[PDB]
């Protein structure tokens, strides 16, 4: 049996459950660190989709661990390799899985959502959903590779060299996009939100301005920076309609927009912004490919500093405090330690 | 004095007006052919914007003619050169005009809208808004260079080689985009509308299928062509919300969308189509640059056949019949002759 954080009955209980089975193509991962994700607080809340999807089962899916066992068909891994992995495990043999487009596999299950999650001592997943972490990258950073991949997918969508970048949303992914943008040559990087704590973190991660748009005018900020013509690149991270609206209004002619945050169903936009300015809008799908993760590793190996994004660390026994910190909204990523 | 087609009092009267003045940087064009544009029928109707903007003045802006006079500062033109030209004349000396982005000039006037138009024996415009037509291109084709430029701007936005292309809207610009798409290597080219006449013209210009979506199911058509995965490229020409909705639903993963038609203000779209499929959406601004027109000439010189797009020709005295044909909706482009 193994210790785990489960939805036994809101909240999560520190339960105890049997270890997972290892198929012919599975790796067995002994978990070292797990981050608390935005999906996780929905489960903790026993909220909308939480009451509709969780089997009731331990949750979680942002993790790093060391391989302790593998099936007899697993290729390319040693016992002892440190790995992180994706949030959704796929079939691995369909045409789409075989070509790396596992976001297209017709049989995806969510780790910690549809099946056993990473909030347990041991995690079994298919080898093709695992990603080896090199020893120069810490466990805490490895544990957030999945949201880092979304930030990278969004922020590297366009060339940023000497470009002015607007980011709407200072959640963890938006804050990582700030640091990426400066790393890859952006000029002005302006991020907006309504949370002073999250924006202060963004400033510490290199934002030119971190603008609380309920306290300060984005237009004023642009005039302060001598860029009244508008931004070259906009990364929409929040999914909030007013943020999207303000981002489109703030783009210059020929501006490029990456859409990561998911708008509500009846979101109307001013398509005159898109057409008259010739904007390019690119949807950033949720489940990035491992080619993104290889660029992630390379950036970390080049001195990209993501460390400020980790604001709280707790032992797994003290998981209650980690969800509290996440809930306040005054946190970056929160790490649970399983040592 | 010169003969002209004016809004003297709905409809347009064959009036008689003084010739235009020639500034230092103007060319004076003796008009040969003029096409009836979608803006023109709005003026003929005395409709929404027509009652709000026309000075009451001769209208029109799709033209070809021969230069008969020029100002003393005009460069690069001979008396006798055949020219077409853009729908909006600009200042020509601002930073944006000097770099060819006259769609960005802060002082643009609409030919036949804000100022004297092309429905007259003589037309004066700034030399930098004129474009020389080579002798191997007929006058009738030259007269439609402006909508042809919009079709080219839209259809060449993406690489089409071996790609399946969906075009929504079989107006003249959509029909020209069909012929362009096949010329530049597209595989399946499917166009939709609700007008059987316009679709039949599209079929004659090379459409794989021309689908009346009130009589026939686009989904059925795609299953007939073994492309259930969806289209690679979608060109939205109509501005109709249901057409836009159906186009987004019909794109495959990684699909590319060019947005030429202008949606109504409160158009909501399903952004899940954009994000989950990773679609790329590009706004096609109304006033394309002359780099587009040079590609247009090159395609015509390579055997692109636009001739079927001209469905009616009338003398200028018989202009009443030309507006009648345009109004029925059973026409391609309609040419008025001024010889
Ligand atoms: Ca991810
Ligand atoms: Ca710039
Ligand atoms: Ca045009
Ligand atoms: Ca295809
Ligand atoms: Zn699969
Ligand atoms: Zn200008």
Curated annotation (Swiss-Prot), chains A, B:
Zn(2+) 2 binds at residues 91, 94, 97, 105. SMART domains: PKS_ER (SM00829). It is found in: Cytoplasm. NAD(+) binds at residues 173, 193, 198, 260-262, 284-285. One of its GO terms (cellular component) is cytoplasm. Its cofactor is Zn(2+). It comes from the Bacteria. Catalyzes the NAD(+)-dependent oxidation of L-threonine to 2-amino-3-ketobutyrate. This is L-threonine 3-dehydrogenase. It comes from Burkholderia thailandensis (strain ATCC 700388 / DSM 13276 / CCUG 48851 / CIP 106301 / E264).
């Amino acid at each position: 049996h193994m210790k785990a954080l489960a939805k036994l009955e809101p909240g999560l209980t520190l339960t105890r459950v049997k270890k997972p089975e290892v198929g012919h193509n599975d790796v067995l991962i002994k978990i070292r660190r797990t981050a608390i994700c935005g999906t996780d607080i929905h489960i903790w809340k026993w909220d909308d989709w939480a009451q509709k999807t969780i089997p009731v089962m331990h949750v979680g899916h942002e993790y790093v661990g060391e391989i302790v066992e593998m099936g007899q068909e697993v290729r390319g891994f040693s016992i002892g390799d440190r790995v992180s992995g994706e949030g959704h495990i796929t079939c691995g043999f369909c045409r789409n899985c075989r070509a790396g487009r596992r976001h297209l596999c017709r049989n995806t299950v969510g780790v910690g959502v549809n099946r056993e999650g990473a909030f347990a001592e041991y995690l079994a997943i298919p080898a093709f959903n695992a990603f080896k972490i090199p020893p120069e990258i810490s466990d805490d950073l490895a544990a957030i590779f999945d949201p880092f991949g979304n930030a990278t997918h969004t922020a590297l969508s366009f060339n940023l060299v000497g470009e002015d970048v607007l980011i709407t949303g200072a959640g963890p992914i938006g804050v990582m996009a700030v640091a990426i943008a400066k790393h890859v040559g952006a000029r002005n990087v302006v991020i907006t939100d309504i949370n002073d704590y999250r924006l202060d973190l963004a400033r510490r991660m290199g934002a030119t301005r971190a603008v609380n748009v309920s306290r300060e005018s984005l237009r004023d900020v642009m005039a302060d920076l001598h860029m009244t013509e508008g931004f070259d690149v906009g990364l929409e991270m929040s999914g909030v309609p007013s943020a999207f609206t303000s981002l489109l209004e703030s783009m210059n002619h020929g501006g490029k927009v990456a859409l990561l945050g998911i708008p509500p169903a009846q979101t109307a936009i001013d398509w005159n912004q898109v057409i008259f300015k010739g904007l390019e809008i690119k949807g950033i799908y949720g489940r990035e490919m491992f080619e993104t993760w290889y660029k992630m590793v390379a950036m970390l190996q080049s001195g990209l500093d993501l460390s400020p994004i980790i604001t709280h660390r707790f032992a797994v026994d003290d998981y209650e405090k980690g969800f509290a910190a996440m809930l306040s909204g005054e946190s970056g990523k929160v790490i649970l330690d399983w040592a």
